[PDB]
Each structure stands twice: as structure tokens, then as C-alpha cells.
């Protein structure tokens, strides 16, 4: 007959593979076919990716039909046509946007999301791939909890940061300390960040030697802080530019406060 790939109730299992404030990964192994992976990542926007990963790669680009088929143990219920996708050659199947959340929802109702398409490896015959809802509820609760505990900013949002200092003292302002805490959280949870560039520089109020001394003291304090997060010393770079290179009109009270600033630039190895 036809080839249907689904996990029987004795085989169906869901796992939370990545559970960190930077990524969530819920994986359902489809026996004899591959994996179904839901991934959510720390970001400012709602994002979910569903990837149907196949052991044998996609032979050709095919139109795929996504249906919400009821399980066998639900007589009298009809199937809902969800949508039509396109699975591309030598790529994992991808569903994103509202449809991935809809797949999760149809699994929450106890149904089977079924992808139907003509398989190139199977003499161009129609095959079905279903996601089992058996043992889904607890892992969906864990997935929702992890999504709740996701950072509301990505690497793009913090990779470049400019912080400001108070008029009198060596401490950062309140907002600058808050942004530094955000940077520290992202760094402490991300192991792929390799480079930190720190460029402190100050206002023209003090003397040139005094400006350089203040800038270097601030740079060394920030370098020690970045060391405290766990990065090795060979990765952090710190430089104090004193009162040179002003970005704002020195002399105005606001301009001097602008120039009293530090640049922090992160660099990752994805």
C-alpha cells in the first residue's frame, strides 16, 4: 500500500534537547524517517521553527500537504486541512510563522499533524509522515516554560553597546549598568562569544593626562568585570582613548556627558 511514517504509542517520545535561556529545542523522533524539531531562540520577536529532518535527504522539491488527521482512537472526527508547503531538495522540511505554532496546537488537541507528499526515493509515490501526540503534554509544558524563560534580546541587539558615566565618579549611570547586566547575562549564557572590544573615552573637562588616566582606569575595571564572567584574558581587549575622538560637541553639558562613554563590541563564533 502506502508508506506511513509515525511513532506507535509504544514508540512515541518527546524530548527537550536544548533548555537554556538562549534556545529551546523539542525533538520528536519519527521512527524509520528521522526527527521533528521545534526550535525557539532568544529574540525580540515571537519565533518558532519546525524542521522535519530526514535520514535520507529530500530527493526533489515537492509540494507537501499539511493536514490535521485524527488518531485512530478518535472515531467520528474528520480531518482538517491545515495548509500547503513546499519541501525543497537536499533540505530539511521547514515550517515557520503561525503554522508551526498551529502544529503545536494541533498536537495539544491530541491530533496528528500529517505531511503528505510524493517521495523521490520511493519511486515517486505518495507517502505520509505524522507527528504523534502520545507523551506530548508534559514536554509541551516544559517547552512553554522554557519559551517563557527566554531572553528578550538577541546577539544583534547587544553586540554593539555604548554606555555612559556619571559626572563625578568612576561608576556607570543607572541605564548603563542595566545594559551591562544584559550584556553579562547574554555572555554568561552564550559560549560562542569569542571577542570583546572595549573603547573607553571621556570628556574634555580634565587634562589630557588626567583624561587618559581616567579612561584607562575605566577600561581596566570593565576588563576585570568581563574576566569575572569567565572569558579568558586572551579574548578581552581594552583601550582608553582619553578625551580624544569626541563624538559630540564638547562644551555643552549634554555633549560632554555624551563623550563620557564606553564602547563594548561583542564577537561570536556561530
Amino acid at each position: 500500500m502506502g508508506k506511513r511514517y509515525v511513532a506507535t504509542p509504544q514508540q512515541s517520545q518527546w524530548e527537550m534537547v536544548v533548555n537554556t535561556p538562549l534556545e529551546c529545542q523539542l525533538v520528536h523522533p519519527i521512527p524509520s524517517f528521522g526527527d521533528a524539531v521545534f526550535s525557539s531562540r532568544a529574540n525580540k520577536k515571537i519565533n518558532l521553527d519546525f524542521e522535519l529532518k530526514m535520514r535520507r535527504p529530500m530527493g526533489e522539491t515537492r509540494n507537501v500537504s499539511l493536514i490535521s488527521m485524527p488518531p485512530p482512537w478518535r472515531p467520528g472526527e474528520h480531518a482538517d486541512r491545515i495548509t500547503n508547503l513546499k519541501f525543497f531538495k537536499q533540505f530539511d522540511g521547514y515550517v515557520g510563522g503561525q503554522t508551526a505554532w498551529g502544529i503545536l496546537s494541533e498536537l495539544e488537541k491530541g491530533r496528528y499533524p500529517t505531511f503528505s507528499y510524493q517521495d523521490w526515493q520511493s519511486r515517486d509515490q505518495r507517502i505520509e509522515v505524522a507527528l504523534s501526540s502520545v507523551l506530548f503534554q508534559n514536554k509541551y509544558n516544559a517547552f512553554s516554560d522554557c519559551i517563557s524563560n527566554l531572553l528578550k534580546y538577541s546577539f544583534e541587539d547587544i553586540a554593539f553597546t555604548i554606555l555612559h558615566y556619571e559626572r563625578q565618579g568612576d561608576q556607570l549611570t543607572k541605564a548603563s549598568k542595566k545594559r551591562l547586566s544584559q550584556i553579562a547575562d547574554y555572555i554568561r549564557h552564550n559560549q560562542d562569544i569569542d571577542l570583546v572590544l572595549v573603547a573607553t573615552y571621556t570628556d574634555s573637562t580634565d587634562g589630557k593626562s588626567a583624561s587618559q588616566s581616567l579612561s584607562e582606569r575605566r577600561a581596566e575595571s570593565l576588563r576585570d568585570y568581563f574576566q569575572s564572567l569567565g572569558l579568558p584574558e586572551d579574548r578581552i581587549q581594552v583601550q582608553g582613548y582619553g578625551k580624544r575622538r569626541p563624538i559630540a560637541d564638547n562644551g555643552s553639558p549634554i555633549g560632554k556627558d555624551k563623550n563620557r562613554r564606553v564602547v563594548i563590541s561583542l564577537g561570536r563564533t556561530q
Binding site: 529574540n43 525580540k44 520577536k45 515571537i46 528578550k152 544583534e156 541587539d157 554593539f160 555604548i162 543607572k174 541605564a175 573603547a199 575622538r245 569626541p246 563624538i247 559630540a248 560637541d249 564638547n250 562644551g251 549634554i254 555624551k258 562613554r261 564602547v263 563590541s265
Partner: protein, 179 residues
Amino acid sequence: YTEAELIKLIEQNKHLQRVRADNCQLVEDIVARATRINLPAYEFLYGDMLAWGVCVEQDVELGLYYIENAAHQGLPAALEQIGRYYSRGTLVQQDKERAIPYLREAASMGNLNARIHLAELLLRDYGSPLDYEDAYRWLYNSVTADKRQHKRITVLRNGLEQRMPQNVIARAKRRDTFW
């Protein structure tokens, strides 16, 4: 040029016009200051000169490199220019979602053009509501003397207000915000 005058000309978008008005006599000085001293105002000026090819030859990659260095040091106008280049697809491949962070940083530093452009992008669904508050805040305590721009800012403020609850609006209007 002095650094302060160059910065003020950059903020007014007349640095290129001024350099043309000088009949490009200080080009060597600009090149030396940008390349060797790494002065952010001169880096931005040299990048704009190279990018759009005024007097100096048109070298888009090198001009964008020097603009990016001015941004590296943190010139708000450089960040705004890179953001609007990405948002409008000028000399770069158009990516508004990539434009958003640059505009956000420039707006947070105090660039009014960046604030207006960021609010416009957000109102076109090119970001997340998790920005509205800040953007609204940045549009709330911003003083302009142009009546057209004032009306535009008020319109964008109302557009953002129609999308956040009273709790978040109250928190936004009730925060320490400067520039």
C-alpha cells in the same frame, strides 16, 4: 576643519556641501586624519566622500568601511546613516530588519532622524512590540523646532500609543530619558 564644526556639519548634512564649497582643498588632510588618527568625524566624512564619490573616486566598499569605523567609535549620525542605507537599500542590499538595530542604537544616542525612522519601521511591523515603549519614550521627550517634523512625531507617537496597554504607556511616560 575643527572637530566640533565638522560634527555639527555632519548633524546638519552639509559636510559634503561644505567640502565642495572649499573646492576640495583639504582632501589630503581629511584622508590623513581619518586613516591615521582615526577621528570619528573625519572617518564619517571620508567614508561619505569615498562612498558617493565626491571629488575623490567612488569606492563604495572602502567608504562603507570608514563609515562603519566612525560608527565603531560611536558617531550617532554614522549609525543612523548605516541604518537608513539598510532600510532603503542604498549601496547595500535592502534589509529593514537588519536596519532596525542600527537605528535603535542611533535613536538611543539621541539622533532624531533615527527615532522617527525607527518608529516608522516599527509601525510597519518591521520589529517587535518590545521596542514600542522605548521608541515611544524616545519620541515623547524629543524637542523639534520644525512644525512639519513636530506633526510627524506626534502622529508616530499616537500610532505607537494605539498598540500598548495603559500599564506600559504609564511606565514609558514615567522614566528617566535624555538627549
